[PDB]
Structure 1
């Protein structure tokens, strides 16, 4: 972990959660926290945590039947979801911010896609900190890891909390074998999102889900 990041796996990072006043999302997300199948699946891992947490229409498949639950393995059972982008494609190249939006929307939830180029840090910080206080509203961020001092390319993960005192957001990093959840300064996360994803030729950003 680069010195700009506070790992959740530390006394400081636990305390940032205990002193946070915008942390409602942490509880349900922690209950659904999963490991990405692989890097290309970071967005799928992220969507299913949020979709399980929203309690929507879950897939009904053999794996867990009679139980209905979102899983990375069953996420593409939804015919509309497959139509957005082939499962095979996502398994190799991941998904863009717009695709993340469309994939979530395909399960009938309300989604607002926010490219960094269409907003600014003040509005991001403010709107997300609000969201993190509300139940039934989740945020997933899409960012370039290396801009926050992490190893490398574009990533997707849900946000769990905002710490007012330190102006840091908690990223529930689905790459759990690689990194812990991390408390990132809003300015680092902004710079990381304000990057052009070469696959979309568009800026990264964040999605609201309810």
Structure 2
């Protein structure tokens, strides 16, 4: 000591709309969730609503019975505008609060569960990279369930704070996951190395004083 830090590394992302990124989807054999999520992909309506956008993508992909939207009647879908129609949802965290400060991993899980949907919240501190990779890759091969991640953007080479978005696929050959980034005005979907995504989840959110992590969602 002191540590001289001779070798330092920065995370390498592959964009979905790159030639390589396209190839990673086509060579993935853990990509069932990509198709329904792609059908539902939305832009977060404000710079704090990443979790709401992520939730409604998953609820619509699961075919969860949705609130009315007068503009679409008789058709009904979850939107960021109607997601808080259920008072139990507002009781977790109110929309005006989310619009200022976002949501924590535990709030994300509780907001989903307020609609009676099955959830399993995994803080990084309570699991490990090997179980994350294995369990998420399995979910990505399975219909009827989805995965949402909460991670510090800085640790995957983006700016900057905590973010939430669904995962859509896992490329086995490169050990990368595809993040369907709902901040569509800022970044494309990206393929991130498991080790970098793990590092980014294994950070402490000062709002919760707990680590970030990932949530499994399925229909009951």
Partner of residue 29 from structure 1, selected from 33, 37, 45: 37
Q: Shift of residue 2 of structure 1?
A: 7.6
Separation in 2 of the partners of 1:23 and 1:39?
28
Residue number in structure 2 paired with 1:81: 89
CA positional deviation for 1:62 = 2.0
Output the CA distance in 2 between the equivalents of 1:108 and 1:67.
21
State the TM-score, normalized to the length of structure 2: 0.93
C-alpha displacement at 1:61, in angstroms?
3.1
The reply on whether 1:174 has 2:198 as its aligned counterpart is no
CA shift digits 1:138-189 (9 cap, x unpaired) = 0000000000000100000000000000000000000001000000000000
Give the 3-state SS of the residue equivalent to 2:49 in structure 1: helix
- Residue 79 of structure 1 deviates from its aligned partner by 1.6
Shift of 1:3: 6.3
Unaligned runs of 5+ in 1: none
Based on CA coordinates, which of the two structures has the bigger radius of gyration?
Answer: 2
- Deviation of residue 78 (structure 1)? 1.1
**CA offset digits 1:96-147 (Å, max 9, x no partner):** 0000000000111100000000000000000000000000110000000000
Q: Say yes or no: does 1:5 pair with 2:13.
A: yes
Asked if the contact 1:24/1:132 (under 8 Å) is kept, the reply is yes
Quote how far apart the aligned CAs of 1:68 are. Answer: 1.1
Q: Sort the Cα spacing of 1:82 and 1:3 in 2 relative to 1 into closer, same or farther, 3 A.
A: closer
Unaligned runs of 5+ in 2: 1-8
Which of the numbers 192, 207, 210 marks the counterpart of 1:202?
210
Note the alpha carbon deviations across 1:11-54, whole angstroms, 9 max, x for none. 10010000000000000000000000122100000000000000
Retained in 2: the 8 A contact 1:57–1:107?
no
| Shift in CA distance, 149/71, structure 1 to aligned 2, threshold 3 Å | same
Give me the whole-angstrom Cα distance separating, in 2, the residues matched to 1:40 and 1:30. Answer: 21
- The alignment yields a C-alpha RMSD, in angstroms, of 1.4
Question: 2:150 and 2:51 mapped to 1: Cα distance?
Answer: 9
- Conserved? CA contact 1:2–1:150, under 8 Å: no
